[PDB]
Symmetry: D2
Subunit: 32 residues, 4 copies
C-alpha cells in the first residue's frame, strides 16, 4: 500500500462526510 | 415531522461510523 | 495492518446501511 | 418547498457515491 493510496481513500471519505453533513444540516433546519 | 426526525437520527448514525473510519485511517496515515 | 483496514471497511458498511435507510425513506416522503 | 427535500436526497446520493468509492478502495488494499 502506498501512503498515497490510503490518503486517497481518506479524501474520498472526507468528500462523503461533506455531503452527509450538508444533508443533515438541511434536514435539521426543516425539522426546526 | 416524525419522518424527518427519523431521517436525521439515521444520518447521525451514518455520520458516526463514517467519522470513526476517517479518524482511525488518519492515524494509520 | 490489514486488520485496521478491515475495521474501517466494517465501519463504512454500517455507514452505508444507515445512509441508505435515510435515502429510501426521504424518497418516499418526496412522494 | 419540496426542492429542499430533493436537494437533501441529492446530497445523500453524492455522499453514497464517495462512500462506495472509499469502500472499494479499501477492499482493494485489504486484498493486496
Amino acid at each position: 500500500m502506498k501512503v498515497k493510496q490510503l490518503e486517497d481513500a481518506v479524501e474520498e471519505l472526507l468528500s462523503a462526510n461533506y455531503h452527509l453533513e450538508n444533508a443533515v444540516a438541511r434536514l435539521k433546519k426543516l425539522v426546526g
